[model samples]
Target: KVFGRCELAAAMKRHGLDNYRGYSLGNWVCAAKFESNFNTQATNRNTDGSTDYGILQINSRWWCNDGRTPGSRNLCNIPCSALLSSDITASVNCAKKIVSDGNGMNAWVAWRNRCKGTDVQAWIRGCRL
Candidate 1:
């Protein structure tokens, strides 16, 4: 609910994600499209009983807590619900931290399954940002 493609791209650019921190805008956009379709409130349950949160679909197993699960790493030090919001700042920061931890976009399965080794330009097609 928080974004269309162009608007997401512009917001990402403003947050220094346009080729910043070794991740491409195309990769980010591609991952976003596949993960949540730009819906900030999007979430999914994993087969392992974990959950993915928000636009980035960050794993609850390692990134945040739903409070239903005990002993979460809570690596981002924020609740999983914080990610599912119109304000993308926390999610983006956590994603950057994940990348900095050396996973890059590999932290996202959508990136591996779709964006990897592909021409990802269409994800940002016609975006003026």
Candidate 2:
């Protein structure tokens, strides 16, 4: 388990997540909410035999290898277990690399489908960071 939405915003701000590749903190937070509800140990298997990892729900096919999933690109070069921890340092770094690769939050289907252009102000409402 991890912090809730407001607390997460504060932590992300403390970790300088307000701006990464021009994406807002709200975007990241909303994406996390949709991805895994802020659960660090979250994992979900896809029909294609791939799985999503951590709060970001990064896919095994591209980001990390869980051994169960074969032929993973592991482009981020971190183990899937690393992303499953409560400490988000590794996960955040990988996310930055992903954002820098040009997909922005659109790389995350959850962000593209749910958080894009919606009223996400509530993601940080009353949270002073």
Candidate 3:
């Protein structure tokens, strides 16, 4: 599978990114690895900041649902938790668009080079892709 996790890979495929690798998959793995360590049932919260939930480390609750916020430019629909029911592929796809237009992997690589030992901004830089 891709995304270094079969489950997340399955989800990406469903979202229309059948070839989730090198670009998006790299970022997906980075998000999942850093947020949840590839744990599909991962969840974290900081009260005011964004929450990282599930395999995609998707804050499916605050920013939006599973993925894509309706017509808004945000790109998240419901909550990261929504991936549970909304499906991983859709959520992953939404995350791909929102993170880097499918360049999420670049984000992961950046994080590895800059932020691996620091905060998310280093990783955020990777998201710029």
Candidate 4:
């Protein structure tokens, strides 16, 4: 599904991303926009042949097990395909666990590149929640 802008932001907020690990709702909102453009079915194949899946673009290499990425960590302990589901429960749960790591939201390159120190706070300005 191509989630509505505010709807996506609300999802992130509702799922505990508002201040999870010190990242604000705007941080998550902006990162997710850049990561998958709110497309729940989005997928990206990396140059190294691993794939990133779903809304946050969870990577197959270290996050989700895709049966292909080398030395798969499967940190999320679910098939990579699970991240592609519209339900987003598994994906958001994986994201919460991801932030539990030392890097926090920096685990997402979109946050590093497109959100960090940027005007991402504007991304959620109009959201109802």
Clashing pairs in 1: none
Models ranked on lDDT: 4, 1, 2, 3
lDDT for 66 (candidate 1): 89
Report the lDDT of model 3 for residue 78.
Answer: 53
In Å, residue 55's CA in model 1 sits off its true spot by: 0.4
Top candidate by TM-score = 4
Reference-based TM-score of each model: 0.93, 0.93, 0.49, 0.94
lDDT of each: 0.87, 0.86, 0.49, 0.87
How many backbone clashes can be found in candidate 2?
0
Shift in Å, residue 47, candidate 3: 4.9
1 against 3, candidate with superior TM-score: 1
3-67 per-residue lDDT for model 4 (tens digits): 88899888877788888878888888788899999898999999998999999999998898988
Looking at candidate 1, what is the lDDT of residue 98?
Answer: 88
lDDT of 2 by residue, 1-129 (tens): 776988778777777678777878898899999999989989999999999899899888988878888776898898899999888887888888888887678899999999999987768878876
TM-score of candidate 2 on Cα atoms, chains taken together: 0.93
Q: With candidate 3 superimposed using the best TM-score fit, by how many Å does residue 105's alpha carbon deviate from the native?
A: 5.6
Which regions of candidate 4 deviate over 4 angstroms? Answer: none
